[PDB]
Design a protein around this nucleic acid. Sequence first.
RNA 1: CUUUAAAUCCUUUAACGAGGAUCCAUUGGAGGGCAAGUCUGGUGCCAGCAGCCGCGGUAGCUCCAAUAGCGUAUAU
RNA 2: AGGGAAUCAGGGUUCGAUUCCGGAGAGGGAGCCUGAGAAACGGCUACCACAUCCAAGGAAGGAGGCGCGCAAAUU
Lengths: 20, 108, 51, 330, 84, 368, 296
Amino acid sequence: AKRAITYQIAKNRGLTPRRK
Amino acid sequence: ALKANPFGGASHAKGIVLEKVGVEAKQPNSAIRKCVRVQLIKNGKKITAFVPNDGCLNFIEENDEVLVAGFGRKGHAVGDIPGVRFKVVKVANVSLLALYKGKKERPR
Amino acid sequence: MAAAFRKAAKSRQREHRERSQPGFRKHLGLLEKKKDYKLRADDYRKKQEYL
Amino acid sequence: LIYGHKADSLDCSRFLVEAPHDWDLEEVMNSIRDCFVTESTYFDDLKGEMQKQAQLNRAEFEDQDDEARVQYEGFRPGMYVRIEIENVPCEFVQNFDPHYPIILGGLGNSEGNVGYVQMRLKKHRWYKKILKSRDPIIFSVGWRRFQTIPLYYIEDHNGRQRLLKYTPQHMHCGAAFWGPITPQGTGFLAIQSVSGIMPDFRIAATGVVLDLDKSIKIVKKLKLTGFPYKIFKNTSFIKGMFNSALEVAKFEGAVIRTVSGIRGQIKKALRAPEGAFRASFEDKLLMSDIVFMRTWYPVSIPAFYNPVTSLLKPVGEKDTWSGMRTTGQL
Amino acid sequence: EVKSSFEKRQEKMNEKIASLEKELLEKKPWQLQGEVTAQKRPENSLLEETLHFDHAVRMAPVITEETTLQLEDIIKQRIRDQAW
Amino acid sequence: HSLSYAGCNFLRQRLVLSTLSGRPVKIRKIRARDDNPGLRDFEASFIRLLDKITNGSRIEINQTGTTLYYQPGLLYGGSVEHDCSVLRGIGYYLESLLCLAPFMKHPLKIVLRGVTNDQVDPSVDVLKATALPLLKQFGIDGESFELKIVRRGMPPGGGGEVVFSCPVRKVLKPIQLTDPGKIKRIRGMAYSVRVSPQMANRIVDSARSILNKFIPDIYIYTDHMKGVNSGKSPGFGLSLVAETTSGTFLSAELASNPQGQGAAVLPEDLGRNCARLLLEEIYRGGCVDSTNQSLALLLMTLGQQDVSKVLLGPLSPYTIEFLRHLKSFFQIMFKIETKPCGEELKGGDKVLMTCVGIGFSNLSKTLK
Amino acid sequence: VRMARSFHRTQDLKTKKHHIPVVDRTPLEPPPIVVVVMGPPKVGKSTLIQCLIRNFTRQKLTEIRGPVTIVSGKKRRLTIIECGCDINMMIDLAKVADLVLMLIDASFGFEMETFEFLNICQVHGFPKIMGVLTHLDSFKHNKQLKKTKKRLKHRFWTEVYPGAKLFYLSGMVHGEYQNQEIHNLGRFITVMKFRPLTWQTSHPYILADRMEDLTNPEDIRTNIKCDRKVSLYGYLRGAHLKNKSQIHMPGVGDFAVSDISFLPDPCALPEQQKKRCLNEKEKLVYAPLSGVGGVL
RNA sequence: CUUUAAAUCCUUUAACGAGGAUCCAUUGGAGGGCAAGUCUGGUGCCAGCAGCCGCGGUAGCUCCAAUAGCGUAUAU
RNA sequence: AGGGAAUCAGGGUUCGAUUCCGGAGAGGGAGCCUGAGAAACGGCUACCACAUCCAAGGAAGGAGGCGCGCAAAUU
Ligand SMILES: Nc1nc2c(ncn2[C@@H]2O[C@H](COP(=O)(O)OP(=O)(O)OP(=O)(O)O)[C@@H](O)[C@H]2O)c(=O)[nH]1
Ligand SMILES: [Mg+2]
Ligand SMILES: [Mg+2]
């Protein structure tokens, strides 16, 4: 019943350009 | 000549956003559009500062407090407009890049 | 950091897609766009100048 | 006298002289004799003015008694006060819970009224779904919490506000709805459902209040479609856009264009079918081309305002409050 | 039984909510739909619609008595000065 | 919660306070015991003026015209053209617009057509000279803040035209006007329309004859408008303005009788009477003139919750009733303290008016 | 050159000082500071509340309900309220809170409710926030404990201004937190300063301490569903209040105030004296809905 | 286990722990791709600026420099 | 007159180690009591200056933190 945070919120990468 | 610069010997300055003169004019140049008018708190002088990219205007409103730095180089990058000597760096002590990339939220 | 702003904007690379001819008018042929019209427009302009 | 016949009289803001002075004797002239002639930065000066006003505000009514002070400046902050409220619903008293706090927010001028509120809105970065226009949503604004039906629109460079189907993924967006008046510059918060628990992030969107008005002025794009049936080089005959000759007369000279991008003009109606017309164009058309004209149609929003009444619930079900459902739930 | 004052307002709200929920599931009218042909819309519907559109060219000027008098005033002035 | 009132007197202030507060007002029994029971045309013209300068208002008039219901909307500015009724002066309508100008959504650009100079209503020359500096004290000053008279008008024909423009402000600055100052110069305006230009000069030498002993510096301007600028009726008048060291202004004005009724007034008598009327104002002098007392009090209440002080002379019956309506609408109570000034020999006693403003902002202004 | 470097550094110091000048409307005698305690449902909110109360008064409190007002220091009083996991409660308290204490489970990590409340605070005006993380006793004073503290601290500094304190509660001795940690935590609340928020300054608001129903008893017998007249007691905060005004009570609706009257202040500050510490007379607890001593 | 007054740390050591090995390195600079979309100006079919917004629908392109480091402003 | 002075030890140049003081004061100036050793790092009396408790009669006393969105080893 505990709402743990997602991976996106834990690491606030945001709009970071994608690299190889 | 210690106080020669418009910032009074400082590297940065704080100002109050008066209006977005580029937005009020209906020209879709995107070089006129990113021009805003601010008034420096230290001496009350009115200058025109540049917003780095269109869409960061959405984060700024009138009567806000912003941090303005000089525009040293790459002045010719903007399209055929004089007076490119200032640029807006922060609003509410938060960098515009952090707000644009979605890394921080503006605190009211 | 003007380039940094542009790179963030171009993170997503999905482009706008083209719409096709309606089904009830399919026998007429393909719906021509600006690139298709420019081929026949420049062809006619080429011949008229020569004549 | 002030705070302790006349009707049907002239509305004149003039002080008539009941008993004028002679102005010929020297003694009368003597009464008015004295009235006639016989390095700090700009930030420091502003700071100096504020301190003088701050001292003046505190040191104005200190002499008068507290009962006297209430009449002139009202109840100051820092007083223990007793408030009497009438017409409270019965379910508040019977279903009272000491754990749930009670807050009393003073309203400003015109905040009790309702109107059209234009807001700058951005969908939250951590919310999974997006917001569809014309679906119910709850706003947390000022002191209030209420559910309304908003319209999402985007601004153009010419100043036109055109309607949007959905909230954009990554951009700010204008929002308009019918609701209570709220002062400009305040933030607001958006939720989809207060009741129930959700594993994901529950805050839908965030923004600021921009405008208050009585008219929305929001418009939507409408296109009327036609198909050619007879072609003479530039001139072509178009059917399907209209259904009567009265329709063509209203739209003579309107700018029309094809899907291919060739621009044209409506010239004159044709009689042989019901609603055809003659149109000239930049270049010759093909049979497969489709022509349309671009028109703008004003839209409207229903006036629906449903405040949240969580405290008006029994003690066990204060969390469960529901309202109008969205399109997906229906 | 007796109905509470808050419960009376809830009944009116419930009727309003039900009517609004009907509209969402209902088919949209032709004005709201984009790209509509003449077949879908009823006859002579656009006459009362008050739509906004743009005109391609300027309309031809209309001749009236006032335009005649101003033009004759110009002619008379040139006659007096012999401004041929 | 709507307020209820009776009668037609004090009609303007009830309507102006209603639209600022946002609370509807009900007016009953307007000129009931009269041969003509209904509303007068000039009052109806004022209501039409409010409708154009606001957005979303609802106004209800009985078929008899004895009762009025007014539901205020938001204030919307822009360009407005209005034709004022000739029975009352343009200055009758201009006082209400001066109260409502800074709180519009858009800057107000209004041109008013009617009669400019009249005996019943204050002249537009007085409002330009004295009322406009008072708003500049509150911070409503701007480059577009001006009154310009295109053409003059006299009753009964009228035919005058003025244009008014005022900037919009989010909040009003507090003021502390407690020192009246000492009178340096006297300025005046002499005007004559549809008559001989000699009438203006015959007024000047009479006003100067009395006022030259108190002050060395008096100079009166003369204005003569020709053609369509003159108007449709003949007349003449004089307006006098006194300036102090502190920047305050005191004014008095008089006008000749209309053509239809009343005996002709000698220009020398008009110049003498107007000068004596100005001296009466000086004996009553304060930081604001008697006409502008109600305007000064209203802008003080609309401050940003600060203590503000003004020093004004004897209270007019108009202002005393205006204070009662302020308590009814905005629930503000001023603190009144009279000043004896017995031996200083300035003149009559003065009244010091102080209050704390209620939290008020311009809700119509657009944040962008 | 050193003078020029000194000159430039002074200007940068001046830049940070610059801000919009505004009239100081803070009261001469401030009301008690509102302190909210929130967190995940079983983190230890109510246990922390008792520790702070016992740190200041020595007066026994049982069945803690609603706001509790205590004297903590010579010149400062605190009103302490617990925030539930219900989203409706979270929204209302953020509008009224002056100080926020957020509880974080160090063993489990960050949860959704912690991040949701921060977003609420940023919308309606950001108050002073101090984060306290508990359950540190699960770790074994090793590399894992040292790295977990650093990981949580850097993520916490992104949401709030950098330099915001995180307090560490090691463990419980007999079901209560250690006295030294609680005493240190109470020292931070005493010396904190607060900025003026825009919404709170413009509008008066009151957190009600006591409610009393004032109706004729026979009217209730005739009709239970009748509208009822209710009297409310609380501290006035924010701005001045007029006699006849419109007030909004969240969760109920809009009402108009009929009568208003001030009362002598309970839990009042002491008349000034130079005693080193406040005696048992000066330490007061006001809690009309909580039950003091043994009586409820 | 050892350590130590007691414990932590270091050194030993039992068992788990990798295919998209998603157990996912960043910062700065320079380019490409687009619709029945919007604005402005013209040299009919063009150009500039720009484009997650289109009729209906809501259930992760390329190259360059440094690399756990890398930019900007002012004075020099 | 924080700075020194010295000292020992050393293969890949020493990011070595430690020691030594000039005095004075204990809310402010005087007087006084013990012991081998103090005109006491501790009692007392008078005067001066502070401050606490009370049933209002009387009784007992002798150092550092912030002002940089920032106060835990002040353990
Ligand atoms: N081990 C450990 N347990 C803790 C700690 N803090 C709180 N707890 C647990 O929290 C329990 C007490 O719960 P509450 O005092 O009611 O705290 P709460 O978060 O308000 O819970 P609710 O009242 O249900 O909202 C105790 O029994 C502890 O087991 C902690 O620091 N360490
Ligand atoms: Mg609890
Ligand atoms: Mg493999």
